[model samples]
Target: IQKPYKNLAKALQNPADVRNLDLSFQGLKTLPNKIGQLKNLQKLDLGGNEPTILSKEIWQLKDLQKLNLNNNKLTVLPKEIGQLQNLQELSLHSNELVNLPKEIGQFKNLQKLNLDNNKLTVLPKEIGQLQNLQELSLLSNKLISLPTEIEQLKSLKNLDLNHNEFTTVSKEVMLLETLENLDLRSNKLKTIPKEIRQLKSLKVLMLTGNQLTSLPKEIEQLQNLKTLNLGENRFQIFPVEILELKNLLELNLYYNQLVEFPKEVGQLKSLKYLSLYHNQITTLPVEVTQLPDLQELHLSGNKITILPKEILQLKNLEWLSLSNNKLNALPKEIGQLKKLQRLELGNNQLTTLPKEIEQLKNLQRLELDSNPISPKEKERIRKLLPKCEIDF
Candidate 1:
């Protein structure tokens, strides 16, 4: 079915009807550079091609609304590709493009651009011209800096720049006021900018690996933010304004230098997943029991000594990880979590757990891998909850 092949040009003769061409697994070595001749082509799927070189003729597909050239050996796209005026989505991932052409700004109709898993080191300044672009993913690239002109994308909503080499981004980069989801995970960012407050629409900010010591005070302006991941940083204390995000749903601050929880954190009524492993927090915040939606709480690898009764207030608590702590005993109220599923208290100083701990109706996995509890107490726990996996 290649459009009633009448001549050599027939392969690309009718672009309009080329909406869904299944060229998959076609061992194609080269794409017909004359593809631009198809004025009506809407979708072109070049996925599963091997070692194929994208022809300069691709730039001629000005009416193309979707293009998939993934899993190919293309190193770069022709600058003339900017001529694709009607392109709404472009997927050129898993390639070797080191940099993008400045003319890419010409795709004013582009709504999504996927360049993930490439060797890109820089983005063209002209990319700011994509006023309608909504999602731009550049994950797994070698990007060190984003073009200063990125602020021009007024309609940009989601930007995924994870797994790159960026050590720091300028405060001006936060000027993208419409951005909602900003993924900067696995990068080299040492500090976050206070100007990030300008992104009033921001709902998710992922900063998993960096050298940040403190957070900017203006962070509270992100009123719409729902999730914040600041794990694996060097901060000695948790930032205070975090609780100001009344709509926050999840927070991951694992592997930091924190010694205590900020009192305001208990105010996050929407929080559910709170991971704080590998820190020096010696005790739990009494206010922590106030969270009605608390679900997964990981406090492993700390110096915690005892489980206070305040923990019983977390009636909705499900998964609790207290491994590697110095806890000597569990409060009788610990069994109050009726929805509790997984409980990890391995490698602790606990010699006994309250008999009431057996009341967790939903208890599924209990990991007591290296606790000092006597074999008798351990045996009781095993007998009391034979349905649960009690690993010692």
Candidate 2:
């Protein structure tokens, strides 16, 4: 129920009462210099506005905690912009920021800095001075390299450089031993060096949207890694090193060129989610069912013709997608998956499905469209699953 003051004029009337101000999407071209009179202003948002230059008085809000100016049309920030020393979260994304004034690093209490969607080809080396900074979002920037001083950020935990222009992983980034979540998606990263082993605390890493064919063996050293995305890469051969991540919980290998699904994936005992879409796989390894905790499995857009009976071993499977496959028939034991909530098998050549599927009372959605099932089988299926929403 707590909302910020939308009317700047009303807020200016009682400046001391204005703890938070939101002038977003107000079609304002300028902020009055009297904005500094808000002695109690703590949070300010000027997003989706037309302000290209902020009044110098804004820097006088010594108690301001958050300043969001995303989607603005700022071309440059004055050196005096660093006067907001008390700001904890500052976002200027979707602007035209190319570089920050050296004084930008003076925020001792700043914890978050979001500068996404900017033309930031250069970053001041003093950025490492933010001792308390925990998260930094620089995605959609054309950053090519990071300065060595970046290692000075000892407390940085999450750094997002996704959609940047980096062709190689910065050595300084690998030195942030405290980093836990790192996103380098949609970049030109070609190799993940063994130096990655230095980040002992890394837990989640996103490397999808790159040109990676394989990962280094040292990646397994990230014992704390829980999630990894390798989608849309060039890994025709499965990177076996991933099998060594014992704590991995979610894995994405979608839209790749892997002709064979890795049976060794069962070795990841902690895995709960796995995506193997559009890999052109013909046969799934029975060992895939050995993942005791797998809850969601995606095998859609493949060339799979048959499912191994061992599929029933996936006791925790709740959602399964097998659409656009070349399946000719499904085993009667498909009904054994008692936990299945949604099963998609559209565009297959099945003439009739085993009546056993009707026993799965939990089945709520079934996709059988584009299949050539006879009218008798369709009638039987309709009579069997009176509760399920069948597509065919």
Candidate 3:
């Protein structure tokens, strides 16, 4: 062994006691074939290396349970990878591989597989053999479709396919009955299939950056959904079925064409974060003031001209954004939000702020730039919010 292998060599001498070996970020290009001597090694991290090929001796460690080969220069993995039958977590993210060895299916005990930011264009049908897999991240891949056999992964709980080349959501994905978090952001999907309702356990569903113009009413069947992202889509109207997701806590609908904020949105009593920024909304229903759990409200780049005094009902609101709107004034009732920490009203036509704004003891940051407030009026507003960092 050479001098650089000295550290790994010294550790390998006590193979039974060396269950974890971290050789990451060592600028290594290869491992010595003698690595096969670590028969008891359960975890190995060789990430951030320059290795274009892994040593075949690695597969001899049958007791290995976790292996991380992320951020490497590898373009091909030997079929011997399947020899580590006990591996439960394997991460190969940020690599240049264009295909996976079909023998990948041999890891029956695997639970998590992260292949994010890879060049893979297809998954081998043998991937279905991982029946115990729970989390699979294929984000930023070149996959245009999934193998029908993917449905056999009944234990999968999270699947991320963001930034992929798929033009549609595969039916095989909807069959993963245990999925809780499904991310399909930045795809070419024009519609969500009704089969999506089959994922009854889904809690977080992200479909941002798609071509969706509408959604299936069956989406309401996702009773456990807590977070939903539908931003940057082509929806001309708010999907009313979303209101039935009573458990939602965070919802994003920015960059849509909706002209009005849905009144039914108040039905989600559990909502804490709501973003409707960059929309065509000209008005919001009075019912919006009834969401008692609301904490953050983003309405930037809208056409709204006035905020209802009833907005004060959101006493728990910690952040409020109304930038790039046409608002000319703010109601004194806004002072009732004692929890307001950040308030954004930049690019509006406001001329001055009411003295009641002084009541926001917790106010920390305020943006009122690009407004018409005169120098004298701005000085007075500064006196009112003596502790706030106001931009104007």
lDDT for each candidate structure: 0.83, 0.89, 0.90
Poorly placed runs, candidate 1 (over 4 Å): 1-17, 32-39, 48-52
Please list the residue runs of candidate 3 whose C-alpha ends up more than 4 Å from where it truly belongs after superposition. Answer: 1-6
Backbone clash pairs for candidate 3 read none
The digit string of per-residue lDDT tens for model 2 on 214-306 reads 899989899999999999888888999998886799999999988888778879988999998888788899888888899999999999999
How does residue 96 of candidate 1 score in lDDT? 84
Sort by lDDT, best first: 3, 2, 1
lDDT of 3: 0.90
lDDT of 1: 0.83
- The residue-by-residue lDDT of candidate 1 on 1-392, one tens digit each, is 23332233445555455545556556777777566566666677776676544667666766678888788877877777777788899998898889888888888899999999999998989988999999999999999988888888898889998999998867656988889999999988887887987989999999988787888888989999989999988879788878788789899899899988776778898888899999999988888888899998999999999777989889889999999998888888988889999999999977777788879879999888777777888888887787998888
Candidate 2 segments exceeding 4 Å error: 1-3
RMSD of 3: 2.7
Residue 231 CA displacement from its true place in model 2, Å:
0.8
lDDT of 3 by residue, 314-375 (tens): 98999999999999899999999999999999999999888999999999999999999999
Where does the lowest 10-residue lDDT sum fall in candidate 1?
1-10
- In angstroms, the error of model 2 at 236 is 0.6
